[PDB]
């Protein structure tokens, strides 16, 4: 689609370019960080739940504090530059300085001397210390995705966009995110399949990493250039933007509740409680399967080039399925089949594509022999099923799960509406991710490996989807009742 007028073009094209560059970098780094962490020497998918908690969220709080104290000393555009340019500096220094020195910075000797002491479940924790530059890459990719996408760009947009433009501009950005998924997938596939220079002695992944980070640097430079252009040619034009507009809404400056003044609001009434249960269950269910799926990827694609090429193809097909969804099942299913079915499609889809995946992962030897008669191994079949599950979730999230969340936010009174919305999006925004990481950390420490914890992940996934299904079924009763009295 292209639902933007002709006069708003000069304002939206720099915005669309900024969003395209930011999402392109986000996808490239999201795939490259998994490639680096999972394919590292002495590392694997077990390092992912340890990073995502013991490095991502403390660095997240550190960066949020630095940003909050920096916004008061720098101007808005100077703040954007001072936050975005360190990212580009790191992504230019990584493949040129930090990755070539990865056999000098990484303390492999101390790392294995430590691993010989810690329990075998802390292999994912000693893989952080063994690959601490790859861990810094993971942290900074997560911080790109958080800061430069959700905080920086979206604050810029919500500040400079008009309310009468916001819906169309955000729909255009939603379709541009899928177009950038397509582009970043093709670019990662190309940079990975560029396993050229047959003359050995060079790192085949070194060239791919140089190409990926070079595309990232060019995209970040185009981002900075479009930001400068929209500041010097648009945000100073009294026709597109005027700071006399958002002051009305900023009179009541955003009162972000800390954690627990909302943890009690999640206990005020069963409505917001069940909605928080839905969000938390989604956040945990999406994370529970990803670590096992990435272990299966490390098994199927040992070297970093094939892993990154699969991640590129996976991003490309996530983009394809996202475009198909946004074009066909955009707002169809919710209004066609009620709120309960729209809220239940995602849990039952995760349930089906997760029990199949965990059956292929647990019953490998039982399946290898029946699947072998179909040309594939249960490892490749589990990889495919996990990729299908991830694609379906990341595709019909924005159209099936978020669309039912916000639809449930409707029949509430404005006070409880905004307060409970803030409560959910302040606690369960990570609570789910951090909990899905902590569950996997505990299961790795207790069980001892990823292959040994997968029978317990399936039981936990069934115990959470059961909560997800029962809470969505109960929330549908309080959603249908309150909607009827709101009519009169």
């Amino acid at each position: 689609l292209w639902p933007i007028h002709t006069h708003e073009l000069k304002k939206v094209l720099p915005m669309f370019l900024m969003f395209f560059c930011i999402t392109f970098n986000y996808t490239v780094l999201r795939d490259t960080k998994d490639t680096l962490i999972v394919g590292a020497p002495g590392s694997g998918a077990e390092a992912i739940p340890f990073i995502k908690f013991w490095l991502v969220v403390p660095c997240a709080i550190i960066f949020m504090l630095i940003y909050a104290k920096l916004s008061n000393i720098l101007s808005k555009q100077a703040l954007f530059y001072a936050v975005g340019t360190p990212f580009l500096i790191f992504f230019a220094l990584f493949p040129t300085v930090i990755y070539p020195l990865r056999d000098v910075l990484h303390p492999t000797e101390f790392a294995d001397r430590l691993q010989a002491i810690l329990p075998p479940g802390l292999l994912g924790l000693v893989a952080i210390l063994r690959n601490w530059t790859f861990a810094a890459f993971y942290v900074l990719a997560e911080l790109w995705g958080s800061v430069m996408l959700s905080l920086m760009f979206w604050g810029f947009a919500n500040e400079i966009t008009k309310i009468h433009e916001a819906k169309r501009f955000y729909a255009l950005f939603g379709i541009g995110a899928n177009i950038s998924l397509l582009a970043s997938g093709r670019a990662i596939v190309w940079a990975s399949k560029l396993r050229a220079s047959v003359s050995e002695g060079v790192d085949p992944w070194g060239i791919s990493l140089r190409l990926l980070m070079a595309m990232t640097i060019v995209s970040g430079l185009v981002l900075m250039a479009s930001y400068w252009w929209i500041n010097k040619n648009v945000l100073t034009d009294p026709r597109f933007y005027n700071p006399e507009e958002m002051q009305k809404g900023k009179k009541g400056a955003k009162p972000k509740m800390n954690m627990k003044d909302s943890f009690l609001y999640l206990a005020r009434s069963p409505y917001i409680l069940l909605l928080a249960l839905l969000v938390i269950a989604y956040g945990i269910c999406i994370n529970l399967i990803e670590v096992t799926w990435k272990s299966q990827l490390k098994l199927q694609y040992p070297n970093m080039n094939d892993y990154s090429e699969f991640m590129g193809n996976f991003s490309f097909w996530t983009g394809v399925v996202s475009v198909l969804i946004m074009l066909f099942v955009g707002g169809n299913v919710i209004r066609k089949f009620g709120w309960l079915t729209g809220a239940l499609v995602t849990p039952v889809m995760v349930l089906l594509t997760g029990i199949v995946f965990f059956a292929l992962v647990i019953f490998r030897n039982q399946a290898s022999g029946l699947v072998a008669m179909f040309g594939t191994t249960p490892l490749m079949l589990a990889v495919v099923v996990g990729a299908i599950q991830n694609i379906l979730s990341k595709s019909t999230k924005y159209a099936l799960f978020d669309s039912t969340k916000e639809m449930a936010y409707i029949p509430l009174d404005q006070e409880q509406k905004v307060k409970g919305k803030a409560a959910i999006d302040v606690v369960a925004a990570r609570f789910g991710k951090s909990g899905g990481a902590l569950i996997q950390q505990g299961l790795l420490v207790i069980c001892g490996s990823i292959g040994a914890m997968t029978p317990y992940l399936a039981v936990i996934l069934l115990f959470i989807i059961a909560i997800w299904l029962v809470s969505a079924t109960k929330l549908n009763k309080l959603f249908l009742a309150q909607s009827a009295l709101k009519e009169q």
Partner: nanobody, 118 residues
């Protein structure tokens, strides 16, 4: 009806070679997915190799990859399995399996026993 029968089992030595046969009958051989399995006494039946429909796609077990090669002949109805560099771990009764083009269960032969330098 779906009679499968194996041939070529026996013994050579630890590191020898053998060529199994699957001279089947009773179905459209050009439209069936064949393959070879084995079941040592006390172990579970594992697969050795499968041949797609014409020889394009072959899937070997990671324990026999490179050593064994599976080949069919849609004209001369028979599935072959050329076994080379036989290890003492290879001793078992080798079954030939056959799945139709759209079915989901594989018919099994009586199986031929292969032993190598006990």
């Amino acid at each position: 009806e779906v009679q499968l029968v194996e041939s070529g089992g026996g013994l050579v030595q630890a590191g020898g070679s053998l060529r199994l046969s699957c001279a089947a009958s009773g179905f459209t051989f050009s439209d069936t997915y064949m393959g070879w399995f084995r079941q040592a006494p006390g172990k579970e039946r594992e697969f050795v190799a499968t041949i797609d429909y014409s020889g394009g796609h072959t899937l070997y077990a990671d324990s026999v990859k490179g050593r064994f090669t599976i080949s069919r002949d849609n004209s001369k109805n028979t599935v072959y399995l050329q076994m080379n560099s036989l290890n003492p771990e290879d001793t078992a009764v080798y079954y030939c399996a056959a799945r139709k083009r759209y079915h989901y269960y594989s018919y099994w032969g009586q199986g031929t026993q292969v032993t190598v330098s006990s």
